[PDB]
Design a protein around this ligand. Structure first.
Ligand SMILES: [K+]
Ligand SMILES: [K+]
Lengths: 193, 196
């Protein structure tokens, strides 16, 4: 029951939903214990030269240096095809609609582009998301040693792998050992709240 | 200084960023220990009858029953004024831009409307957010007893009451799913990081 997390990372020409284009999407599925269930999928999505010419210089330099911009010019994959490839990959692991949450770092940004451009993928995923950066920001306040001790971080598919490693790290440090507290302790705490 | 969490909940005519209107916004600031730093602020934002008439029946019924729809009709507050009232409230507690994260349940939805309609508020908050529902969904898998033991929610469907429920939910997870402070040793943390 509920043994899949869908990990997605996107790259864009920028973060403005009124004008920027989605140019890369990667997907990996894990079980609930963060074991990777397959090799996943990453797709570079075509954007025309006019769209790419709108990138601010910091993003232009980043996408030039990673080789993404040249891959975008050479891509023959449109939005609808990328959506079908990602959703078919997910449906191989996730059997029910509106069950699997989207997981990643600052995943709301990626979900904004998916909602705009990939409505079928948006509708298939649970509306709830697992933002690893939510846990990062809580540890930053509650457990500074955990925040400063994060494993070192190194394109969509590599970013996903690092998000999974960061959550594994928080599970092992910030979260209680299974099975967690007693049913009576839980009841007492809930009662006060 | 990283104490402060900014808690915001919005109400809308619907969740479609192409057409729906933001009709209520509430804000509370907490310290890092989730103590409320003031009484906060909630503002009903005017929308015209044409916009309100586009609400699907389940949303129409929710906003009718809470009194929100009638408060919207009577409101003289526009988006720019609501944004200024919320941002002035936050700036009383949060001294630096791009420092305080936005906190709530499924807070991405609210942030989407804030980014569209309130660019100054959007820019003042950290881009990072604390989604209490992220913790809920992790506990649902890792600690079913914690997930099923959550405190009962009032379900006011009004911005300020919803914020209070989000804070109580995070207090509940902090007391159950998270290790007692100060947590594991620097050496234990290093050993775990090394394996990953
Ligand atoms: K990215
Ligand atoms: K709400």
């Amino acid at each position: 029951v509920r043994d899949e997390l869908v990990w997605i990372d996107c790259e864009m020409t920028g973060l403005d939903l009124k004008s920027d284009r989605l140019i890369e999407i990667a997907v990996l599925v894990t079980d609930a214990d963060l074991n990777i269930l397959g090799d996943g999928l990453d797709v570079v999505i075509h954007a025309d030269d006019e769209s790419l010419s709108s990138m601010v210089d910091v993003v232009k330099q980043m996408h030039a240096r990673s080789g993404l911009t040249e891959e975008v010019r050479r891509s023959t994959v449109d939005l609808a095809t990328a959506e079908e490839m990602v959703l078919d990959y997910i449906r191989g692991h996730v059997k029910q609609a509106k069950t699997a949450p989207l997981a990643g770092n600052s995943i709301a940004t990626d979900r904004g582009f998916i909602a705009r451009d990939m409505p079928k993928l948006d509708d298939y995923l649970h509306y709830r998301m697992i933002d690893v950066s939510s846990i990062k920001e809580l540890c930053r306040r509650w457990y500074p040693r955990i925040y400063f001790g994060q494993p070192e971080k190194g394109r969509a598919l590599a970013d996903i792998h690092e998000s999974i490693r960061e959550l594994k790290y928080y599970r092992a440090t910030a979260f209680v050992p299974q099975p967690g507290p007693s049913t009576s302790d839980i009841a007492a705490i809930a009662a006060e709240l």
